[PDB]
Design an enzyme around this catalytic site. Structure first.
Site, PDB file in Angstrom:
ATOM      1  N   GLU B  28       0.786  -1.229   0.000  1.00 20.27           N
ATOM      2  CA  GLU B  28       0.000   0.000   0.000  1.00 20.27           C
ATOM      3  C   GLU B  28       0.823   1.287   0.000  1.00 20.27           C
ATOM      4  O   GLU B  28       0.269   2.373  -0.152  1.00 20.27           O
ATOM      5  CB  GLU B  28      -0.979   0.001   1.177  1.00 20.27           C
ATOM      6  CG  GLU B  28      -1.984  -1.128   1.102  1.00 20.27           C
ATOM      7  CD  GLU B  28      -3.244  -0.856   1.896  1.00 20.27           C
ATOM      8  OE1 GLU B  28      -3.187  -0.839   3.141  1.00 20.27           O
ATOM      9  OE2 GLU B  28      -4.297  -0.645   1.263  1.00 20.27           O
ATOM     10  N   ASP B  32       8.058   7.326  -4.486  1.00 19.27           N
ATOM     11  CA  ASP B  32       8.584   8.610  -4.914  1.00 19.27           C
ATOM     12  C   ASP B  32       9.834   8.397  -5.745  1.00 19.27           C
ATOM     13  O   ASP B  32      10.580   7.440  -5.531  1.00 19.27           O
ATOM     14  CB  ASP B  32       8.942   9.491  -3.707  1.00 19.27           C
ATOM     15  CG  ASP B  32       7.721   9.948  -2.916  1.00 19.27           C
ATOM     16  OD1 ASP B  32       6.605   9.954  -3.468  1.00 19.27           O
ATOM     17  OD2 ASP B  32       7.891  10.321  -1.737  1.00 19.27           O
ATOM     18  N   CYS B  57      10.675  18.757  -4.805  1.00 19.46           N
ATOM     19  CA  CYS B  57      11.408  19.200  -3.628  1.00 19.46           C
ATOM     20  C   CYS B  57      12.880  18.821  -3.689  1.00 19.46           C
ATOM     21  O   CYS B  57      13.263  17.860  -4.353  1.00 19.46           O
ATOM     22  CB  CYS B  57      10.779  18.605  -2.368  1.00 19.46           C
ATOM     23  SG  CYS B  57       9.054  19.095  -2.114  1.00 19.46           S
ATOM     24  N   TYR B  79       9.877  22.245   5.183  1.00 16.34           N
ATOM     25  CA  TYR B  79      10.008  23.120   4.030  1.00 16.34           C
ATOM     26  C   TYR B  79      10.778  24.384   4.389  1.00 16.34           C
ATOM     27  O   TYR B  79      10.600  24.939   5.474  1.00 16.34           O
ATOM     28  CB  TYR B  79       8.633  23.553   3.517  1.00 16.34           C
ATOM     29  CG  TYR B  79       7.779  22.450   2.952  1.00 16.34           C
ATOM     30  CD1 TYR B  79       6.742  21.893   3.699  1.00 16.34           C
ATOM     31  CD2 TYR B  79       7.988  21.983   1.658  1.00 16.34           C
ATOM     32  CE1 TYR B  79       5.929  20.900   3.169  1.00 16.34           C
ATOM     33  CE2 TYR B  79       7.187  20.990   1.115  1.00 16.34           C
ATOM     34  CZ  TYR B  79       6.158  20.455   1.874  1.00 16.34           C
ATOM     35  OH  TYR B  79       5.353  19.482   1.335  1.00 16.34           O
ATOM     36  N   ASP B  84      15.011  30.103  -6.456  1.00 19.53           N
ATOM     37  CA  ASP B  84      15.369  29.925  -7.865  1.00 19.53           C
ATOM     38  C   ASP B  84      16.819  30.389  -7.975  1.00 19.53           C
ATOM     39  O   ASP B  84      17.184  31.404  -7.386  1.00 19.53           O
ATOM     40  CB  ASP B  84      14.527  30.824  -8.780  1.00 19.53           C
ATOM     41  CG  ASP B  84      13.142  30.269  -9.064  1.00 19.53           C
ATOM     42  OD1 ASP B  84      12.256  31.089  -9.377  1.00 19.53           O
ATOM     43  OD2 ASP B  84      12.936  29.038  -8.997  1.00 19.53           O
ATOM     44  N   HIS B 120      10.745  28.662  -7.372  1.00 16.27           N
ATOM     45  CA  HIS B 120       9.947  27.542  -7.849  1.00 16.27           C
ATOM     46  C   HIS B 120      10.446  26.162  -7.427  1.00 16.27           C
ATOM     47  O   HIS B 120       9.915  25.147  -7.872  1.00 16.27           O
ATOM     48  CB  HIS B 120       9.808  27.627  -9.373  1.00 16.27           C
ATOM     49  CG  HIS B 120       9.146  28.888  -9.841  1.00 16.27           C
ATOM     50  ND1 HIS B 120       9.797  30.102  -9.875  1.00 16.27           N
ATOM     51  CD2 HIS B 120       7.876  29.132 -10.251  1.00 16.27           C
ATOM     52  CE1 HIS B 120       8.958  31.040 -10.283  1.00 16.27           C
ATOM     53  NE2 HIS B 120       7.787  30.476 -10.517  1.00 16.27           N
ATOM     54  N   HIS B 137      11.342  10.627   3.648  1.00 16.37           N
ATOM     55  CA  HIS B 137      11.923  10.514   2.322  1.00 16.37           C
ATOM     56  C   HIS B 137      12.981  11.599   2.133  1.00 16.37           C
ATOM     57  O   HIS B 137      13.888  11.459   1.314  1.00 16.37           O
ATOM     58  CB  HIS B 137      10.831  10.605   1.254  1.00 16.37           C
ATOM     59  CG  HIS B 137       9.898   9.433   1.254  1.00 16.37           C
ATOM     60  ND1 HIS B 137       9.021   9.178   0.224  1.00 16.37           N
ATOM     61  CD2 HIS B 137       9.716   8.438   2.156  1.00 16.37           C
ATOM     62  CE1 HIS B 137       8.341   8.075   0.488  1.00 16.37           C
ATOM     63  NE2 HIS B 137       8.745   7.607   1.655  1.00 16.37           N
ATOM     64  N   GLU B 158       6.513  12.808  -5.906  1.00 18.19           N
ATOM     65  CA  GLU B 158       5.613  11.652  -5.855  1.00 18.19           C
ATOM     66  C   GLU B 158       5.125  11.155  -7.205  1.00 18.19           C
ATOM     67  O   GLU B 158       4.641  11.936  -8.019  1.00 18.19           O
ATOM     68  CB  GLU B 158       4.372  11.973  -5.008  1.00 18.19           C
ATOM     69  CG  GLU B 158       4.641  12.509  -3.614  1.00 18.19           C
ATOM     70  CD  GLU B 158       4.856  14.008  -3.589  1.00 18.19           C
ATOM     71  OE1 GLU B 158       4.999  14.621  -4.669  1.00 18.19           O
ATOM     72  OE2 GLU B 158       4.885  14.576  -2.476  1.00 18.19           O
TER      73      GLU B 158
END
Lengths: 196, 196
Positions: B28, B32, B57, B79, B84, B120, B137, B158
């Protein structure tokens, strides 16, 4: 013979359809998919992600972002801290979750505490005056929603070619529009409408 | 007959190949794509975006993030403010730009002022101790790069199904791996390797 008249495009937008939006009539313009934030479903979000960069943004008016306590990320850029609607989401990145968060940002009953920050959705702050002040796609999204009589919130993302990942230029956007039955408009065309 | 031995996977990773990473052997789990940040090309980023959520990411060690002045977005997926790489990018969202930014975040010569924020690309802060501290991850990406003798930086996203936009579970990941010749591993398997 390329761009859809604004009034016809607004009706499509009001009915939950996407609109391909270019800056103006130039062939080199890159197209973005835009639709009403409150109307984006799981399937529509899956569609948006499938054919775009996946960096899905949700244009909101500055007034709305302030109400939801979504300040600029740094105390078309102008990003706010990212977020996920708490109730109803798990990973936040799924089409279901991103669509739910997007609709929630548009919902007038939503409250600041209803969202988790950071998240997987990128809200954008549209400047007051919208397209009459700044011709950005952020302002365009909120302008479309307003003209359609909907909440001042939209959702957008850049169309990308499956062959090489390059952003879709006008020709490819025209092709995409015909294949998927999506109307195309440009900001210059929209500014002329709201101005006269 | 499903998961590639870690040493073989590391060689693939070292050679710039993507790896499909699951949490453990459960059917299940959602997979990624992860590869070395310094080796991601325009083509590979286009590939990553094409088959993923597009919310790309870039896992980095907390130490590297601090050096690049990429503080946490808010003061759980860690995060940092988005960014950029300035020189060489335009829209920042293109495959070329996102790949360049990603490689730049790995380049030890990069400096804080070399990046524009917000941007971005979504850098992530991996906790000290990597997988021995947190089995995310994010930590996995940095751990893979470290084990491969590369800069402590990776890039992830993902995997999503083209049919309905649902994240790929183990069965779909195996099919994806065989179709594109990409090896699959899982975190539990990796922690075991680094342990003992």
């Amino acid at each position: 013979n390329i761009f859809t008249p604004i009034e016809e495009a607004l009706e499509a937008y009001k009915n939950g359809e996407f609109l391909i939006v270019m800056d103006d009539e130039d062939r080199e313009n890159e197209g973005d998919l835009i639709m009403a934030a409150e109307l984006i479903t799981q399937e529509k979000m899956a569609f948006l992600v499938r054919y775009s960069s996946g960096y899905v943004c949700v244009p909101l008016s500055e007034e709305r972002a302030n109400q939801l306590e979504l300040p600029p990320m740094l105390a078309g850029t102008a990003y706010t801290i990212t977020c996920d609607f708490a109730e109803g989401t798990t990973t936040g990145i799924s089409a279901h979750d991103r669509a739910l968060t997007t609709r929630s940002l548009a919902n007038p009953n939503s409250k600041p505490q209803d969202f988790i920050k950071p998240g997987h959705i990128l809200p954008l702050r549209a400047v007051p005056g919208l397209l009459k002040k700044r011709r950005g796609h952020t302002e365009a999204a909120v302008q479309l929603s307003t003209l359609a009589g909907l909440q001042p919130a939209g959702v957008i993302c850049e169309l990308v070619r499956d062959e090489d990942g390059l952003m879709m230029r006008l020709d490819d956007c025209i092709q995409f529009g015909k294949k998927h039955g999506i109307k195309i408009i440009n900001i210059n065309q929209l500014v002329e409408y709201i101005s006269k």
